[PDB]
Design a binder for this molecule. Structure first.
Ligand SMILES: C/C=C\C=C\[C@@H]1O[C@](O)([C@H](CC)C(=O)NC/C=C/C=C(\C)[C@@H](OC)[C@@H](C)[C@@H]2O[C@H](/C=C/C=C/C=C(\C)C(=O)c3c(O)cc[nH]c3=O)[C@H](O)[C@@H]2O)[C@H](O)[C@H](O)C1(C)C
Ligand SMILES: Nc1nc2c(ncn2[C@@H]2O[C@H](COP(=O)(O)OP(=O)(O)O)[C@@H](O)[C@H]2O)c(=O)[nH]1
Ligand SMILES: [Zn+2]
Lengths: 208, 83, 385, 99
RNA sequence: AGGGGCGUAGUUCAAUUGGUAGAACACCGGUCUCCAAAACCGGGUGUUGGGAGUUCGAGUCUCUCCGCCCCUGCCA
RNA sequence: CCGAGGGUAGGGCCCGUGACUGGGGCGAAGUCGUAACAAGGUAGCUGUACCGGAAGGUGCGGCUGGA
RNA sequence: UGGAGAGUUUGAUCCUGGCUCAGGGUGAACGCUGGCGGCGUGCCUAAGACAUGCAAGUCGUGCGGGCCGCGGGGUUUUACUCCGUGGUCAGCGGCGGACGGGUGAGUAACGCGUGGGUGACCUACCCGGAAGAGGGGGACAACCCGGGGAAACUCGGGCUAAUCCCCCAUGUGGACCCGCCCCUUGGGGUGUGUCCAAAGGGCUUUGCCCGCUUCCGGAUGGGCCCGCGUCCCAUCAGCUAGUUGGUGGGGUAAUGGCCCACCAAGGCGACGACGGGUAGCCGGUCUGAGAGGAUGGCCGGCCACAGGGGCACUGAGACACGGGCCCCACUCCUACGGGAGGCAGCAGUUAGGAAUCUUCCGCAAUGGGCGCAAGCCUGACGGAGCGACGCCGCUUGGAGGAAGAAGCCCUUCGGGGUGUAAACUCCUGAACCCGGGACGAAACCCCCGACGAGGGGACUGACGGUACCGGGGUAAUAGCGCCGGCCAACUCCGUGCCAGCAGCCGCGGUAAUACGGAGGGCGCGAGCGUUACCCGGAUUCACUGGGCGUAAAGGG
């Protein structure tokens, strides 16, 4: 299940710093900032020119690790992404963005994705009225995601909703910092997601 | 004779029927001479019942024995309201 | 066409003992006809019974004889009291002492003595001289031999006038009455121990049957707690893994039982189990209570020769057979260092690893035998593995 | 151990006799007719044949024959007889076969 | 559950007069070789199925126990 | 009359098996030679026939994939 | 909207070619491990054998009795028990048990698929239309009584009722023979002759509701026939006497050598007859870029079978899964002359097997049979149970936290690694606690209105006190594989061609990224591997899409 284990360890290994921890993985110490190299007893030595295979794995893992999704859903979502009309690169990314917990984190609320998940698993999150607890919930157009009323006075929702004064949300999501709402105006685009992931490779990983 | 019953589709704890004109001797969900409507007994959808007419009456005007619930639904869709 | 079983009278089971061809097995085949004239309406141990108008009884008539010890024993522990049958002929003989000895190594309390074969040449100072030897014998063994209700009579003769008319009452025939003196002998003296029903559960397996149309049935006496139909149970003992099942049936002497209490001899039809998966020894308890263990540091007291035990002593690496609940295993022994001098009459503790997993729980008792004699008894302490 | 059904075997046996007889009757009567129609007995020929025909259509009343089974048995008579008489006889009794 | 059997090196088989238990062929250890095979020297390497028992000693004779084979048992 | 099945009898097809026997495959370090590979020490190969512990030899004709 | 290749012949090269791997899939099984839920799904083998219980009945408004509880004495008493209501045991009549449910043995064939034919046919109950429903007669059960028997039951005498049976009449009409007209294989009209009908039951009573009879039409469901399509062996090449055709019959709802006499001598075959092996066919399912290849489990259509085998009876329909007759094998009872039985229905046992479940609850719903109706029956069906057997969702926590504890592991002794990982701090609250708690169910029926349309009323929930909602609430599971190359991931020790690994290439003979253990890493995660089998890759049977001088391959 959704990994659960050392993460600022993948911050490393994939070689492209990540913040799966939010606060700290943002400080002068994302783990990377002290060992921009792979874990293990080796981790810091001559690297063979990565096999054309290795490359894609690395690209997929990179992308997938970024979300916390299990391989099963990931591929699954990718297959779906395929049939749907349009470019898989774009589409699949979009579908990766609709993931409730993701929107939860993409919209203040949660500092980390892993924390945006526990929020949805515990109920604190809500959608078009009725609350949803499935991280995999697939958000659509025009749906605002409000917090709950029993949480609003929680020590956490405060600070995390506090870092919202000033900062601006993605070009495809609004936000009523006061009355915790925020809608999902429209599916994100390739560009908007400034992600260190070469989608077309990840795609190629699923060809063979 | 040639009845007018309901064949259970949908799934476990999710009824959804199909108003059909089958030869009484078939199985409930077996083959069937023709379909003329559906019925979601749990309503859950503004249209849990919809049925054809010119055809319902047709089979009715040729010896098609409706069932208790079947006849009910037919009626409820203004099948016998002769005006 | 089965018939239920209803509780009213207390339940107690007992068995016969004596020298091979003597009185038992036939005494049994008579004591039954008695308690059957007024009610109920109508080589291998033979679980039977009889309902006196005073109590419910389950008779265990172990075939007896030598060679049949392993089987003899497993039945002795199942009873609260035994009927020591003795004949008027050769009188107290070898296997009459042997069975009695065992009885006093199984905890078997109280003994009812019934002299059979009296119908053979009435010797004046004999049926009065026989009881002498007996009582003295029960004493050479520490038994309460001096308060045992000794009654005489040719049991079988009480049967000829039964196997021709199943309606014989009391009084008539100084034989078929003669057998009511042994009933009012067990009705008295031999108590009725308290069987705790506040405990988990446990039924040592004795025999296993494949009842046609229903499946495997495990017969056994209850160690404690209770078990009715539809209760999850586990089979702990032998086997590679402890398999779990649901009790789909319970019966008392081929009669539907509505609820089993301790002390009861009941057959258990387990849901989905092969006659090859269950076997004597292993027990049936509540999922969770007790588990399986091969090694233990039990406290043991090696009997003294002058009382059957060894007269030499064993060195660490002695492989004997330990008796648990209803069966016997085998196991190497390791001494707690320097103690490589455990000889007769001694009393110590050590390590033992049975080559067959068996239910062990620390607080359980057992015996040790090798070479045809109980070399020592004891109790278990916390398990190693 | 048992059930209704039996009620069906008993009736079975009954109805069996009911038309087993009606049957072998039409048979012996169909024979006699021709057994004369080729004799020359035109008169006492169309007489029993007239009876036969009765018994045939009569059997059709019940579960004995019905439809063409009865209709057919008829032709192969009014054909077997009619084509047995015109072999030197002339249809006397205008009672039965059509003139 | 109860009878009757067989278990000896690495494997096939002897000592069945109560006496540390040997033959064959293998294998192992050196020597030569990178290492083997050959060749030359030199070795019984064995829980005598386990464990106890009589005893001056038990492979042989008692009992118990393990695995396997065989016959015969077993509807709460 | 027909008729399931049962007999007696003789065929066909398939499978199992048999003392013994034919050749085949495979198998770290066995025996005998030396056919072939370099006119491989008699160019080779080939159909056939006779012969020979064995590879093979020889005869007749053929091929060059032999100078 | 759709196509990826790699390893391996050599000292090296190019080519040919085989083997092997990476991807999907499975009614799965085996190993390690295992928390929840939803929807699925579960004897692939012995069509082996089976203890129990249950899978089909219902109508008294078709008809006559027995019997028990009771209006209340018939006569004035317990004698005509007449009568009256609801019951109740079988009987007689009726409709249904020929559907629904199981299985795949058999079948290579009009069995199936697809398209048609029938002037060669049938079709219970249901519809619309036409006309009728009048005289009469009789039987056998049940029951009383006698009898043989262990039983199952059987026989004899005698009452008796019908919607049972039979006779006459009526002939709207219909059937048959012959003539004629239209028409074209036997269809439709007509005329003379013959032949054929029928039941009364309940009320609320010159009327209705339920039935009845004959004909016509409609529906629906079927039978029979035909074209094309449907596996491997040619080391199977010739097969055939009811054989092929005819004539007249028998037979059938109906065509037909289907069956039979008699006559003719035919019919079939390399376009594969006959024979052997295997197999139920299809919609579809898996794979595939496609063309194809494989398959045919769950659901739906067709077929076939009901211990093995033959046969009919009843009936609209069966040669009939829980009907009958008989032979056989096996199961049991037996008072030894004859008796009972068939789980490939449901749940369960045993055997076989690598392997496949509960003797569960409910007719509440849908469907079904019988019923005027109430209602009864219904292991069809609706559900619950068991197994990660599959798919889908969910959990084992989130956020802080050191130039970085310990332990373990490496180390050029300075250090590096597992690692923000932990511990530690705040932190949300899977489970579980208390309370509330369904949708699935609105008709039949009752009242109004005529029992029609429409309007109103009442009963009814197996799953379940489950889902779901509210409030309370503890940090609470991790494994399996793999790390020489293919193929993502490397270091120490042990071992020393041993022990072992191995899908292919190949590793191991004292420094082994290849054995075994460890540290560390990689993949995936309630799973992860293994074995088996299908497609792919394999343009490696090549139609799409290959080849033959010397690689296999040109016939002398
Ligand atoms: C023995 C088999 C199974 C035992 C199982 C278990 O035993 C127990 O663990 C039990 C717990 C104490 C146990 O350990 N039993 C294990 C032991 C227990 C021993 C206890 C009591 C004693 O005391 C020293 C007791 C008999 C004592 O002996 C004396 C007898 C001496 C006899 C000498 C023999 C004589 C003349 C003779 O002719 C003779 C002979 O008999 C045999 C053979 N050849 C002979 O020639 C006297 O009679 C005393 O009374 C529990 O009861 C368990 O619940 C159990 C029943 C499952
Ligand atoms: N004379 C006599 N014979 C007896 C007596 N008890 C049993 N029997 C006989 O002993 C023989 C049976 O022995 P059994 O009952 O089997 O004793 P078990 O061997 O102890 O079971 C038979 O002949 C019985 O009739 C008795 O008390 N007196
Ligand atoms: Zn980080």
């Amino acid at each position: 299940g959704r990994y659960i284990g050392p993460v600022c360890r993948l911050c490393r290994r994939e070689g492209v710093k990540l913040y799966l921890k939010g606060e700290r993985c943002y400080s002068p110490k994302c783990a990377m900032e002290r060992r921009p190299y792979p874990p293990g007893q080796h981790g810091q030595k001559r690297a063979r020119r990565p096999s054309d295979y290795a490359v894609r794995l690395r690209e997929k893992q990179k992308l997938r690790r970024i979300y916390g999704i299990s391989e099963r859903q990931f591929r699954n979502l990718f297959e779906e992404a395929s049939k749907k009309k349009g470019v898989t690169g774009s589409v699949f990314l979009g579908l990766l963005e609709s993931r409730l917990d993701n929107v939860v984190y993409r919209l203040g609320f949660a500092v980390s994705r892993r924390q945006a998940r526990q929020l949805v698993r515990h109920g604190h999150i809500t959608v078009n009225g009725r609350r949803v607890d499935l991280p995999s919930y697939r958000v659509r157009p025009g749906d605002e995601i409000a917090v709950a009323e029993k949480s609003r006075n929680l020590e956490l929702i405060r600070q995390n909703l506090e870092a919202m004064k000033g900062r601006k949300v993605g070009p495809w999501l609004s936000l009523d910092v006061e009355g915790m709402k925020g809608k999902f105006l429209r599916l994100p685009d390739r560009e908007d997601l400034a992600l260190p992931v070469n989608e077309q490779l990840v795609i190629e990983f699923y060809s063979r | 004779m040639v009845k007018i019953r309901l064949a259970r589709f949908g799934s476990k704890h999710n009824p959804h029927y199909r108003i059909v004109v089958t030869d009484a001797r078939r199985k409930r969900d077996g083959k069937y001479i023709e379909k003329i409507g559906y019925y979601d007994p749990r309503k859950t959808t503004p249209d849990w019942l919809k049925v054809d007419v010119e055809r319902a009456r047709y089979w009715l005007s040729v010896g098609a024995q409706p069932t208790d619930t079947a006849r009910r639904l037919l009626r409820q869709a203004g099948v016998f309201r002769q005006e | 066409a089965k018939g239920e079983f209803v509780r009213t009278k207390p339940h107690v089971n007992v068995g016969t003992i004596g020298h091979v061809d003597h009185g038992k097995t036939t005494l049994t085949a008579a004591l039954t006809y008695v308690a059957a004239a007024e009610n109920p309406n109508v080589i291998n141990t033979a679980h039977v019974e009889y309902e006196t108008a005073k109590r419910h009884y389950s008779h265990v008539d172990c075939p007896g004889h030598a060679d049949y010890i392993k089987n003899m024993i497993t039945g002795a522990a199942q009873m609260d009291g035994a009927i020591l049958v003795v004949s008027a002929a050769d009188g107290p003989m070898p296997q009459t002492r042997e069975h009695i000895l065992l009885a006093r190594q199984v905890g078997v309390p109280y003994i009812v003595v019934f002299m059979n074969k009296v119908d053979m040449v009435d010797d004046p100072e004999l049926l009065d001289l026989v009881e002498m030897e007996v009582r003295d014998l029960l004493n050479q063994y520490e038994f309460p031999g001096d308060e045992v209700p000794v009654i005489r009579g040719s049991a079988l003769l009480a049967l000829e006038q039964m196997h021709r008319n199943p309606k014989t009452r009391r009084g008539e025939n100084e034989w078929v009455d003669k057998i009511w003196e042994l009933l009012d002998a067990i009705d008295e003296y031999i108590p009725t121990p308290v069987r705790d029903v506040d405990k988990p559960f446990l039924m040592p397996v004795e025999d296993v049957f494949t009842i046609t149309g229903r499946g495997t049935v495990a017969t056994g006496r209850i160690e404690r707690g209770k078990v009715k139909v539809g209760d999850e149970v586990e089979i702990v003992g032998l086997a590679p893994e402890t398999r779990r099942t649901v009790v789909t049936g319970v019966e008392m002497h081929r009669k539907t039982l509505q609820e089993g209490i301790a002390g009861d001899n009941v057959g258990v039809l387990l849901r989905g189990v092969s006659r090859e998966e269950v076997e004597r020894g292993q027990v049936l308890a509540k999922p969770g209570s007790i588990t399986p263990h091969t090694k233990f540091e039990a406290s043991v007291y090696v009997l003294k020769k002058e009382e059957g035990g060894r007269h030499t002593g064993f060195f660490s690496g002695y492989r004997p057979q330990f008796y648990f609940r209803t069966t016997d295993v085998t196991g190497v022994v390791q001494l707690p260092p320097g103690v490589e001098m455990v000889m007769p009459g001694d009393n110590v503790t050590f390590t033992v690893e049975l080559i067959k997993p068996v239910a062990l729980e620390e607080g359980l008792r057992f015996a040790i035998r090798e070479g045809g004699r109980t070399v020592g008894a004891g109790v278990v302490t916390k398990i190693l593995e | 151990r048992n059930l209704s059904a039996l009620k069906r075997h008993r009736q079975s046996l009954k109805r069996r006799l009911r038309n087993k007889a009606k049957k072998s009757a039409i048979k012996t009567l169909s024979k006699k007719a021709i057994q004369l129609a080729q004799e020359g007995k035109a008169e006492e020929a169309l007489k029993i044949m007239r009876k036969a025909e009765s018994l045939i259509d009569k059997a059709a009343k019940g579960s004995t024959l019905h439809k063409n089974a009865a209709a057919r048995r008829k032709s192969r008579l009014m054909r077997k007889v009619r084509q047995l008489l015109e072999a030197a006889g002339a249809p006397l009794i205008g009672g039965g076969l059509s003139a």
